[PDB]
Amino acid sequence: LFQPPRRPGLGTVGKPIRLLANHFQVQIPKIDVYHYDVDIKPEKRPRRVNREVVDTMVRHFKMQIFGDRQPGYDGKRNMYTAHPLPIGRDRVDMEVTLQTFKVSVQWVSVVSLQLLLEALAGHLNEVPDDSVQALDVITRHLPSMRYTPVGRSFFSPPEGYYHPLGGGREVWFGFHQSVRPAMWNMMLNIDVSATAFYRAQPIIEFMCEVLDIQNIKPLTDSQRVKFTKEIRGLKVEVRKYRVCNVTRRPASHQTFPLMECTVAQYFKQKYSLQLKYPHLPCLQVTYLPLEVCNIVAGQRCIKKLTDNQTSTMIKATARSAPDRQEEISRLVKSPDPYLKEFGIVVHNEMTELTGRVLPAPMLQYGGRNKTVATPNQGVWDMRGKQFYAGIEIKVWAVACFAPQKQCREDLLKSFTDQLRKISKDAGMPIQGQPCFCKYAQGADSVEPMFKHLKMTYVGLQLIVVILPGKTPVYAEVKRVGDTLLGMATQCVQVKNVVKTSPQTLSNLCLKINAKLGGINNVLVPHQRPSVFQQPVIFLGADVTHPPKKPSIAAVVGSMDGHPSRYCATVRVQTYSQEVIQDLTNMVRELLIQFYKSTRFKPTRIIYYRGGVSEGQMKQVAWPELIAIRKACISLEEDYRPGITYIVVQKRHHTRLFCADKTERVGKSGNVPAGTTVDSTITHPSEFDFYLCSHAGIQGTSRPSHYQVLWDDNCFTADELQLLTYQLCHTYVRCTRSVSIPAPAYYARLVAFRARYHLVDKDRDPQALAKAVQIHHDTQHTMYFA
RNA sequence: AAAAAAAAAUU
């Protein structure tokens, strides 16, 4: 365990901007809360059941134990009261019926809310976790009884609204709620929310949606296989059951040992029911005919959404910032005996605060002249500018996997002609026509074609691949190119070939130049923070998880002092589940490539860590710090550069709004790029800040939250905020400030790519590891661009 | 995959 650094001070750089945040002040008195352990048997019942078990225990045992107490309870083992229960330190056993439960209640501790207030007043080092937890349980007791909790959110069925997603799924709306420490006062973070549920409906209706069926003959081959995969694991009601599988033969014929009896007869002997769909199968739970079953209401959709379900939901849930602002405000302003029990009061107005809009860097371009760009509202363009270091492309090939019918030769020639012209304008001149331009079909053609190209065209620098929409070909192109043969590839969808655009072509060149080792632009050097006065390396790290399938760890590192070029490392691995297991070897590799490229080891390591929750970040940071130092020692004994460890988070629900309407930007009306907050809603003592580095395009922007868990380098607040913002302008794929620093974003791209490498075109842990190994001809290139 | 942003316990 360790102490993260204190906030070194408040930032003062940038234009002041009046803001509102969806943090609502919580008034807490200087009182105890009394904490009791709750032991319910039978053991693991669903959390919602424990809540009603305890809720009914409280009411039935009123005169004997609870009296006028309104206890907070988390649905697990934690109960909180404003005054001690009449039971001393003794474990008291009770019994309650709904099934009969046995519940034990026992004093475990006094929790001090005054101690929490002392920490918020700066009088204390650490914010006490027991107090924050008590407050969370108390303030979320009522909505937990009234709504359907999902994580820290609460949802309600779509009463009187029709919001379909397809595949038997629907949108439920609700809100996120969390308690957060701030200076002086606790805050309640409230944000509107929405998520996907299975609609409560007849199984037969569900079956028709999933299985392509317009209207009402037994099922078929691959109908039933997909109908299963969508219904397996769901609760149905007729009492409730769980679906193991569906049956292969119809209810008319599906037997079970009773005699030997089949399903249809069984339900007219008892239920006196003539099946209207005896030709339909049964759900295995063990057999229930479809027409007797309904999906049970309130089941979260856990499976991944299709791409269009995802779209539908965003369009149903993405509102402009001022619209989101008004919805939050109205939600909060629209009785709570658990709050009253502890004299807790929640203010119904958003917190007002002042942030700063940081100045954006200037970017240096090159080629024909030392041209420059600086963003306006988070965006700039490459018009009339050439790359700082542009690659000359002399040998390149085109492979079109779209049908010639769909992408005629004159369409293809026009595409390559235009791409040549744009590339020359950008200072990455594609010299002459492709050495190879052919049509092909199917992923199976990729490997022999690329082998042939590598064999035949010495100096081949690039293969441009035209794809026919979503296809297995993409994953195979990257497998062969990145891992098998080490050949740079740039894919492009046929729709962007047959219907071209200069912006699209220009953006392609951004990626191609980076892939081939060019430098698109650099931060203007003398305007970087002072950290660049000595060799410094920037690392970005992330871990992606599957929804069996492996987790993937990615760490990227700058390879020059600009910083523009980055090298990647990636691993397959199986709170300690979040730690990057091979971090020492990965960081070692990146340090060595930096050393090789610049001829210096860095005196400082700046490490941006994505993919970790607030609750686990300290537990993750400590072993990762040890691992980074071990990597340093492996390059040279006693080599101890200063490390700054910064967690980047954007899955939180803090939202910032312009207090002054005239300062809203664009149709979405968001805060401007550069908007930074390091007071009022941030941590009372630790070193954290919000920075909305990007321009909001649609809906409400999510400002990234940065938490400094370690800092040998003693950054000032301004230096680190400015550094972080400038790194958001070095991302090669667009001339825009992006929402997280380039190295953190690359780490995600590297992890996503590894997923494609793991696809099996039609496994052992060492096999998984070799699958994501990049070929050496590309291992130190920006293949992930 | 031009790109960013944007939603998440009888049969």
PDB file of C-alpha atoms (C1' of nucleotides) in Angstrom, chain A residues 235 266 287 474 478 493 655 702 731 739 745, chain B:
ATOM      1  CA  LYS A 235     -35.751 -16.706 -17.254  1.00  0.00           C
ATOM      2  CA  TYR A 266     -49.241 -34.020 -20.728  1.00  0.00           C
ATOM      3  CA  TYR A 287     -39.859 -29.516 -21.196  1.00  0.00           C
ATOM      4  CA  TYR A 474     -10.363  -7.726 -43.026  1.00  0.00           C
ATOM      5  CA  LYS A 478      -4.353  -7.966 -40.854  1.00  0.00           C
ATOM      6  CA  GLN A 493     -14.451   0.078 -47.990  1.00  0.00           C
ATOM      7  CA  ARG A 655     -20.742  16.000 -17.146  1.00  0.00           C
ATOM      8  CA  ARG A 702     -17.533  12.998 -21.623  1.00  0.00           C
ATOM      9  CA  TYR A 731      -2.867  11.502 -32.599  1.00  0.00           C
ATOM     10  CA  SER A 739     -10.598  12.776 -26.030  1.00  0.00           C
ATOM     11  CA  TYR A 745      -5.678   5.811 -27.508  1.00  0.00           C
TER      12      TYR A 745
ATOM     13  C1'   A B   1     -12.513  -1.398 -42.652  1.00  0.00           C
ATOM     14  C1'   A B   2     -10.979   7.339 -43.972  1.00  0.00           C
ATOM     15  C1'   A B   3     -11.942   9.659 -39.306  1.00  0.00           C
ATOM     16  C1'   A B   4     -13.477  11.762 -34.745  1.00  0.00           C
ATOM     17  C1'   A B   5     -17.378  12.212 -31.352  1.00  0.00           C
ATOM     18  C1'   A B   6     -21.499   9.918 -29.253  1.00  0.00           C
ATOM     19  C1'   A B   7     -25.402   4.999 -25.631  1.00  0.00           C
ATOM     20  C1'   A B   8     -24.433   0.512 -21.709  1.00  0.00           C
ATOM     21  C1'   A B   9     -33.454 -18.798  -6.341  1.00  0.00           C
ATOM     22  C1'   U B  10     -41.216 -30.353 -12.183  1.00  0.00           C
ATOM     23  C1'   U B  11     -41.051 -32.747 -17.222  1.00  0.00           C
TER      24        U B  11
END
